[PDB]
Structures are given as C-alpha cells and as structure tokens.
C-alpha cells in the first residue's frame, strides 16, 4: 500500500485520503414501533380551529401542526384486510380494525401547546370529520411542496400546488382554504421538510392509507413522496430491470466491473423485506431507523450511473434528466453503458409460447446471441474502449434533448463533442 | 436466484425485488344484484327544485344528487326485447316492462337529505317528466366531464359540454339550465367521477339504455364512458384483431414472448361474460364486483404496447396517440411490433369468394407466406433485432406526427432518431 | 473512453472458477 520515491535515500510515503462510508440498514430487532416526541393533546375541535386560522393567516407553528395531525389520526381508521407481517411487528391482523395511532408509538408530553392563531377563521361551530380530513391533507401537501424547490421549476411548483387544492375542494373533502393560500403558505414554509416530526407523521399517514382503502385516501398526494424516500438507487435498479426486460439476477451478470461489488452487497443486505409488498421498508427513511440510506443514488453510485448511461443510450428521458454521481467513475460507467446499451437497444429475445394444439407445443419442445459472455468478449475485442458508434449514438441523444446542468445528458455532451 | 461475488470472498446473495398485484375478477356467485345504500327517497318535485337550484349555483350535494337519480329511475320504463340473463341472475323476462331500478338493488335508509335551495330555480309549478329527464341527463353528464380532465385539451372538454347542452335543450328534452352553466358547475365538481355512488348510478343508467330503447335514451351522452370502463387493454385487443383482419386465436400465436402468457391468461379468464352482449361485464367497473380491473391497459401492458406499436408501424393515429405503459418492456415490444407491422403493412390475404356460376365455384377447388412460423423464423434470422427498414418506418411515422406528451409517438421519436 | 472491465458476477461458483482459468492499462 505504501508507495516509495527516492530523494537522496528511499522515502516510502503512505497515501492517505478520506473516503469514510457509514450506512445504517433499516430493521426492527428490538420489536419497537417508531417513536417521536409530541406536545400536549389539544381539544380536537379547538385544534382544528387553531390550525385553520393559522394556515389562513400564513403563520407556521411546527408544534401545533404536528400535535393536530396526531389527534387527527384517531379520525381515520379501518379494519385490516389480511394479517400484516412486518419487521417482527404484527400490529395489524385480518379482521382487526387498525388506525394510524396503532401503527406507530407517539410520545405525548403534558407540556402545553401554544395553539395560537393569528386570525382569518370565521367558523363559529365544531368541525365535521371531512373538514378535519381536508386540513390534514393540506399540511401533508405542504411537505411535498417543500421537497420540490429546484431551479427552472416555475409553472411546475405552482402546478403541483394547484392539483392539491383541487383534490381537497371537491368531495369527499370540503374547501376550507380558499385558493392559492397553500402556495403562499409554502413560500412561508418551503423548508418544512427538514422537521423530523412532520416527516415522520407524513410517512405514517402514507403507510396507513396505502395499506387500507379509505374515503380520504386522496390525502396521500402530499405523502406519496415519503414512499421509497432517499432510495432512488434501489428504485432505479428495479426500473432498470423492468425496462431492460431481464431478471434481477441476469441483470447483475452484465455488471463487468469490480466497483459494482460493494454496491451490489450494499443494496442487497440479507433479509431487509425488500421483496415484502407492504412493509416498514417502503418508508424506512421517513419514520425511524433511517440513518443515511444505503440505497441512495450516492450509496450505489456506480450502479446508478451505469443504469442511466444505459438509459440514455436507449433514449429514456428519465435517465437523460437524472443527475450524475460525479464521484463514481462516470467515464468508465459510460463505456460499459455503451456496450450494454448497444446490446439492449433495438433487440429482443423472442420465443414461441402460444400454440394451436398440444401436439404443436410438443413439436416445438422437441426442437447475434444475447449473453453476458458474448458482451464481455465484445468489450475485450475492442480493448475496453468505446466503439465509434457508441459515441455517435450518445452524441445524437444528448444533442437533440435539452440538457439540465448536472444531468447525464450534459455529461454526454461535454465528454463527446465529435 | 443465486450470485457469486465479493471483494475477496465468494459471497452468495439471493437478490430480492418487490412485484405484487391483486387483479380481482367480476362475478356474481351469490346471485345478488349490485347494491348501494343511500338516504330516504325524496318527493321528486321537491328534490327537482333543490338539484336545479344547486346546478345553477354551481354547488351540489353528492348524496342529494344520488338520491334524486335513484328516485328518477322509475320514470324511465320500457319493454325488454328478449329474455335478459346476466350471470346467474335473470334480470327480466322477454316482454316484461323494466326500469333502471330493476337492474340493480337499491337500499334506502330512513335518513333525511338536506335538499336545500342554493341557486336560481324559477319553477312555480310541478316539473314534467321531460324537465326531470333533462336534469337527470345534465347531472350524469358531469361524470364524463370529470373523467376527460387531463393534460392540455381544454377545448376538447369545452366542446363536449356545449354538445351535451345542445342535446338536452332539444326535444324530447327541455332547456332548464340556460347556457354555459354545465361547464362552470363542472369546475366545482371536477372530481365527482371519484364518487362511488355517482359512478354506480351512471353505470346503471348506461346499462339500462344500452338494452332498452327509450324516449330519453340520449342520456347515454354522459354515461357512455362507463361502458367497458378501465378495460382499454381488452378493447385494444379486439380492435387490433379487426383492423389486422385476424381471428382472436391466430393473433395470439404472433405474441412471441414469455411476458404475454400471464397477460393472455389474465384477460381471457373464463366465467366472465366477455362474449355476452348485454352482461354485467360491460359495466362491471362502473358498478360493484370489480376491485382493480384485470383488463386495464396497465394490467395487460405488454399486449397493449405490442398492439399499438404495430398500429404505429401501420400509421394508425389512435395508436400514435395512446399513452405507452413504460413498465411493460416497451423496447422489446417495439421490436416485435416492428416485425409484426412489417408483415401486416401493405399486405392482405385475398381469395376469390364471388363467382358467376355454381360450376365456376366448384372449378375453383384446386386453388410471401403469412404464418406465425414464417414471422418467427424471420425474427430469428436477424437475431431478434430490428431491421433497418423497421427503424426507417418507425421514425417516418413518429416524426410526421404531433407527438403527444407520453404517447407512443413520443417514445418512438426519442428512441429511434438517427 | 476506456475502462478496465472484468466479469465479476456469476450464477455459480463453478462458473466463477472457470472464468478464473481464462491494450492494457
């Protein structure tokens, strides 16, 4: 490991660079439901009144909003269709009625909440359950709005806010926040995604409504972002598998580089309920046991870059607009992506599977090539160098598409200009 | 399944990816007609004043509107032309007068409706049956207006609304809502399509007017969308069969891929009255007994993608404008579609069928190749890869078309462009 | 425009051993 130079005698200097990598995996070994600390429980009706005026008033109170959401969890409840097996916890069983309050553990402190209201609320009567659901959904949409941000997002950040208001102004929800109050409140509260309790609650809501069909399931429009949070690498891989029409296993066979080993191991920890249809895993980054996600595009950077380099070769716009992981050797990944993309672009593996009669099937059963080995030898024949055609294709895809600043398209344009 | 890979060890990892669906099929084993529960039947005349006032005011109560529609079903009555059996239930006997009220089971609770007066209603006298049928049609037309919401358009929704107004302002209907009121109230009722009881009633009316000719059968202008609702995959398959001029069976033989097996099995599940002309199946999604439809374009995504890729190759505008199911291996589908379209584009199976004399027909008894085997072997000869002519054709079709946002035309342009 | 590529993932340990039995950076 030490590498040596001589000045007058031999020096043998060691090379030290920082490359720390610590990733926590999501699993419940203690059998404990995720826990957050909250304020004093308010009167449901009084809480609804305070938050409605505060929202109309463009006044943001973190403690009040989260406490209100926890109280509202009692309103939304449904019986569980089937027995629910998670990370050793089975809070839901078939024929058992469940609520958001039962799925997670919330710690309530008797410390009084401020429940202060700037004003703008004229309602003199106790709120109905739908009014409660309409307000609950709007806050969760504030969270999704915070995640948006970006640049050149004009007439897009406004659009998503408009969609949210439209859902909660129509049945089963009732319009309580006039128009454009949600957009302007977001301008006042654009960084609310940072708050942990707000994020945790959105994740709890999304998990319950995804599991149980509900009258107010449309509130999920705000909480949809919580699903597969900070897991784009795992999500990109699953999509890559489907777009390429391969099995996860065969797909990994094409990964002809040493760097993939660490990432493949990282994203496939033993167990982890990745395969489980409904599990804590989908919302692990929200809720608890998050840590830093080992599934993020950065954690699995080489696989991510290869997937989207392949995607650009195939003209997938999603890959064209994805932001490249600059650290994880994008140049080598683009070369492998060129060979993989050429193999998979415009080619399919077809076999007769439908026959008129059983005897015809038997005859077909008694009776250039797509394989990892074939691709590898092809790469070796060219000395591990891109073919000129790969370069042309890459250049043609990047030049016609509009390139975002840190996108794969921009990298392809800058890297190959001829 | 299995992997061998590590930094310095032979680690064995089973790779896990999540992919589950339900796809429940429509069937009446209980032999009970579809049922919805709603409030106490109102006095028709009083209910008519409330909903009209509500229409002109752009404020409508979903529960009140639904009770009026269920109460109005008695107005529409007609003779049944032939004996009517749907699933195990025999809805009516030949020559029996029937109403929409017989087709399903309606259960009313003793609960009173608000039936409140909000907007300008001027009727000082009892409403006539035409006024009732004009309002019933105007109310059901909101469902179609709700569904046709989507990207761009606008002019399309505006044109359909004015056409609907023209129908119910012309005989046998009477103008009750002046002009442009239907469009403005829809802005307030944009998501009413989501309402389950409203959808159930639109579907019930549509099923009734499908079989029984009536004076007011023109109400279908709103409820027509419920027919084969969420079954675009099955509808695309039947249309693919007719334009291509093949039999259902022969067409499936051309599906040379394993992926089709699950989808073919899913959409041709027996016991579902797919073939029956006036069965519950035509409106199953609108009524109960559905869940998620197994015939939706996503459910049969691979078949759907192949059907429309063949159509694009043949220049069918419907296919150019359909939205591609990105999950269902579009690239592989496009390649198979290129070969199939090549076979079916510019070619026909012609035989003499018409003759001058019977003797001439008997003379015509003794008397490049279109077969699944020929196409498959053609595919195999090129290694499952698109021919250069295939790509030229795909590009010519996509480029000389105004590509819609996520249309097949857009995919084709992005994918094959040099 | 060049990468050092080697087969690293195999279905079988035997497959791995065979690949081991098998212009330069």
PDB file of N, CA and C in Angstrom, chain B residues 15 22 73 78 84 159 171-172 179 202 212-213 218 228 238 249 299 315 342 379 391 396 405 412:
ATOM      1  N   UNK B  15     -31.011 -12.167  -4.692  1.00  0.00           N
ATOM      2  CA  UNK B  15     -31.469 -10.804  -4.939  1.00  0.00           C
ATOM      3  C   UNK B  15     -32.991 -10.775  -4.872  1.00  0.00           C
ATOM      4  N   UNK B  22     -53.127  -7.692  -7.399  1.00  0.00           N
ATOM      5  CA  UNK B  22     -54.326  -8.395  -6.939  1.00  0.00           C
ATOM      6  C   UNK B  22     -55.169  -8.873  -8.114  1.00  0.00           C
ATOM      7  N   UNK B  73     -85.229   6.888 -11.467  1.00  0.00           N
ATOM      8  CA  UNK B  73     -85.143   5.663 -12.274  1.00  0.00           C
ATOM      9  C   UNK B  73     -86.505   5.081 -12.630  1.00  0.00           C
ATOM     10  N   UNK B  78     -89.402   0.614 -20.077  1.00  0.00           N
ATOM     11  CA  UNK B  78     -89.530   0.103 -21.430  1.00  0.00           C
ATOM     12  C   UNK B  78     -89.677  -1.401 -21.444  1.00  0.00           C
ATOM     13  N   UNK B  84     -83.570 -11.614 -20.614  1.00  0.00           N
ATOM     14  CA  UNK B  84     -82.318 -10.992 -20.162  1.00  0.00           C
ATOM     15  C   UNK B  84     -81.720 -11.702 -18.946  1.00  0.00           C
ATOM     16  N   UNK B 159     -65.813  21.677 -25.872  1.00  0.00           N
ATOM     17  CA  UNK B 159     -66.660  21.257 -26.969  1.00  0.00           C
ATOM     18  C   UNK B 159     -67.644  20.184 -26.529  1.00  0.00           C
ATOM     19  N   UNK B 171     -85.699  18.639 -28.229  1.00  0.00           N
ATOM     20  CA  UNK B 171     -86.719  17.651 -27.867  1.00  0.00           C
ATOM     21  C   UNK B 171     -86.161  16.232 -27.985  1.00  0.00           C
ATOM     22  N   UNK B 172     -86.533  15.308 -27.089  1.00  0.00           N
ATOM     23  CA  UNK B 172     -87.636  15.313 -26.109  1.00  0.00           C
ATOM     24  C   UNK B 172     -87.339  16.032 -24.789  1.00  0.00           C
ATOM     25  N   UNK B 179     -77.422  28.628 -20.856  1.00  0.00           N
ATOM     26  CA  UNK B 179     -76.188  28.137 -21.474  1.00  0.00           C
ATOM     27  C   UNK B 179     -74.986  28.333 -20.562  1.00  0.00           C
ATOM     28  N   UNK B 202     -74.428   6.247 -12.787  1.00  0.00           N
ATOM     29  CA  UNK B 202     -74.168   6.493 -14.199  1.00  0.00           C
ATOM     30  C   UNK B 202     -74.078   5.175 -14.950  1.00  0.00           C
ATOM     31  N   UNK B 212     -82.436  -1.283 -23.514  1.00  0.00           N
ATOM     32  CA  UNK B 212     -83.824  -0.863 -23.702  1.00  0.00           C
ATOM     33  C   UNK B 212     -83.861   0.473 -24.430  1.00  0.00           C
ATOM     34  N   UNK B 213     -84.467   0.488 -25.613  1.00  0.00           N
ATOM     35  CA  UNK B 213     -84.613   1.760 -26.300  1.00  0.00           C
ATOM     36  C   UNK B 213     -85.660   2.582 -25.561  1.00  0.00           C
ATOM     37  N   UNK B 218     -80.971   9.311 -24.977  1.00  0.00           N
ATOM     38  CA  UNK B 218     -79.901  10.276 -25.212  1.00  0.00           C
ATOM     39  C   UNK B 218     -79.133  10.644 -23.944  1.00  0.00           C
ATOM     40  N   UNK B 228     -67.395  -0.606 -20.747  1.00  0.00           N
ATOM     41  CA  UNK B 228     -66.027  -1.125 -20.848  1.00  0.00           C
ATOM     42  C   UNK B 228     -65.030  -0.204 -20.155  1.00  0.00           C
ATOM     43  N   UNK B 238     -59.395  -6.385 -29.115  1.00  0.00           N
ATOM     44  CA  UNK B 238     -60.441  -6.663 -30.091  1.00  0.00           C
ATOM     45  C   UNK B 238     -60.283  -5.788 -31.334  1.00  0.00           C
ATOM     46  N   UNK B 249     -57.600 -16.185 -31.923  1.00  0.00           N
ATOM     47  CA  UNK B 249     -56.565 -17.186 -31.670  1.00  0.00           C
ATOM     48  C   UNK B 249     -55.317 -16.931 -32.489  1.00  0.00           C
ATOM     49  N   UNK B 299     -52.756  -3.511 -16.799  1.00  0.00           N
ATOM     50  CA  UNK B 299     -52.880  -4.921 -16.444  1.00  0.00           C
ATOM     51  C   UNK B 299     -52.378  -5.817 -17.560  1.00  0.00           C
ATOM     52  N   UNK B 315     -49.365   3.355 -39.130  1.00  0.00           N
ATOM     53  CA  UNK B 315     -49.840   4.731 -39.236  1.00  0.00           C
ATOM     54  C   UNK B 315     -51.190   5.017 -38.622  1.00  0.00           C
ATOM     55  N   UNK B 342     -44.370  -4.981 -40.116  1.00  0.00           N
ATOM     56  CA  UNK B 342     -43.838  -5.244 -41.445  1.00  0.00           C
ATOM     57  C   UNK B 342     -44.677  -6.310 -42.146  1.00  0.00           C
ATOM     58  N   UNK B 379     -37.728 -13.401 -37.633  1.00  0.00           N
ATOM     59  CA  UNK B 379     -37.170 -12.754 -36.451  1.00  0.00           C
ATOM     60  C   UNK B 379     -35.872 -13.427 -36.039  1.00  0.00           C
ATOM     61  N   UNK B 391     -36.711   0.523 -38.552  1.00  0.00           N
ATOM     62  CA  UNK B 391     -36.418   1.801 -37.904  1.00  0.00           C
ATOM     63  C   UNK B 391     -36.754   2.976 -38.817  1.00  0.00           C
ATOM     64  N   UNK B 396     -40.214   7.558 -39.594  1.00  0.00           N
ATOM     65  CA  UNK B 396     -41.022   8.336 -40.522  1.00  0.00           C
ATOM     66  C   UNK B 396     -42.407   8.582 -39.943  1.00  0.00           C
ATOM     67  N   UNK B 405     -47.636  14.111 -25.172  1.00  0.00           N
ATOM     68  CA  UNK B 405     -46.682  14.022 -24.057  1.00  0.00           C
ATOM     69  C   UNK B 405     -46.065  12.648 -23.821  1.00  0.00           C
ATOM     70  N   UNK B 412     -41.340   6.678 -29.719  1.00  0.00           N
ATOM     71  CA  UNK B 412     -40.669   6.299 -30.957  1.00  0.00           C
ATOM     72  C   UNK B 412     -39.680   7.363 -31.386  1.00  0.00           C
TER      73      UNK B 412
END
